Design an enzyme around this catalytic site. Structure first.
Site, PDB file in Angstrom:
ATOM      1  N   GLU A  20       0.784  -8.425   0.855  1.00 26.19           N
ATOM      2  CA  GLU A  20       0.988  -7.023   1.325  1.00 26.19           C
ATOM      3  C   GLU A  20       2.469  -6.711   1.518  1.00 26.19           C
ATOM      4  O   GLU A  20       2.757  -5.647   2.070  1.00 26.19           O
ATOM      5  CB  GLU A  20       0.195  -6.788   2.617  1.00 26.19           C
ATOM      6  N   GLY A  51       1.311   5.865  10.953  1.00 23.17           N
ATOM      7  CA  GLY A  51       2.750   6.165  11.107  1.00 23.17           C
ATOM      8  C   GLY A  51       3.602   4.935  11.415  1.00 23.17           C
ATOM      9  O   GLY A  51       4.839   5.035  11.256  1.00 23.17           O
ATOM     10  N   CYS A  96       3.289   1.912   9.850  1.00 26.89           N
ATOM     11  CA  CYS A  96       3.341   0.959   8.708  1.00 26.89           C
ATOM     12  C   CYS A  96       4.776   0.849   8.208  1.00 26.89           C
ATOM     13  O   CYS A  96       5.468   1.896   8.079  1.00 26.89           O
ATOM     14  CB  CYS A  96       2.356   1.282   7.589  1.00 26.89           C
ATOM     15  N   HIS A 142       0.832  -1.231   0.000  1.00 36.26           N
ATOM     16  CA  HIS A 142       0.000   0.000   0.000  1.00 36.26           C
ATOM     17  C   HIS A 142       0.863   1.276   0.000  1.00 36.26           C
ATOM     18  O   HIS A 142       0.290   2.358  -0.234  1.00 36.26           O
ATOM     19  CB  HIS A 142      -1.040  -0.026   1.111  1.00 36.26           C
TER      20      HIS A 142
END
Length: 182
Positions: free
Chosen positions: A72, A146, A148, A41
């Site tokens: 992911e 914040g 990730c 992402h």
């Protein structure tokens, strides 16, 4: 404060950079040579900022499992003039549960941040921002915007990268040794 934080600090000081894309600033884990990982992402393009230096992306691959399900994790090769310390021997070989993990973050906003998150569950399937995702680790900490890309470690193992939360729990994508065979 203890050997958990000691291992975490050692990984953060030598194997992390600040990655900036059009979607924000992320903790980015360097694994070997010029190869790093980041949550998918982050939407890595042709150019990324690494510690505020304009850097060409030589290759980027959004990993999926053999059920063709999102993991992911994006693997990025950076046009950087320096190699990472090789930490592939600290990656687990198999999906597992863990005791006593630390989540470590380094950005402009959260410098030198270490969070003892405790027990880590092999959760498996998660609907993550509406995307079916596999190989998710879960821990019971109210993680926030914040974090990730944050690195999840135990003493002697680098087990995942933080990819989301629901206000009460946090979720990490597993790192496995087999992702980084060269």
């Amino acid at each position: 404060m203890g050997p958990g934080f000691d291992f975490a600090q050692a990984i953060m000081k030598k194997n992390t950079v600040i990655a900036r894309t059009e979607k924000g600033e992320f903790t980015m884990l360097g694994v070997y040579d010029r190869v790093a990982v980041i949550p998918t992402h982050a939407s890595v393009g042709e150019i990324i900022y690494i510690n505020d230096v304009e850097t060409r992306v030589l290759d980027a691959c959004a990993l999926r499992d053999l059920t063709d399900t999102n993991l992911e994790i994006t693997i990025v090769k950076l046009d950087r003039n320096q190699k990472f310390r090789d930490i592939r021997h600290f990656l687990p070989r198999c999906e597992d549960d863990y005791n006593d993990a630390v989540l470590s973050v380094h950005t402009s906003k959260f410098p030198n941040m270490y969070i003892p998150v405790g027990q880590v569950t092999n959760y498996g399937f998660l609907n993550l921002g509406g995307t079916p995702t596999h190989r998710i680790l879960m821990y019971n900490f109210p993680t926030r915007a914040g974090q990730c890309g944050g690195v999840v470690t135990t003493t002697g193992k680098v087990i995942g990268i933080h990819v989301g939360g629901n206000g009460a729990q946090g979720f990490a994508a597993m790192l496995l040794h087999s992702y980084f065979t060269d």
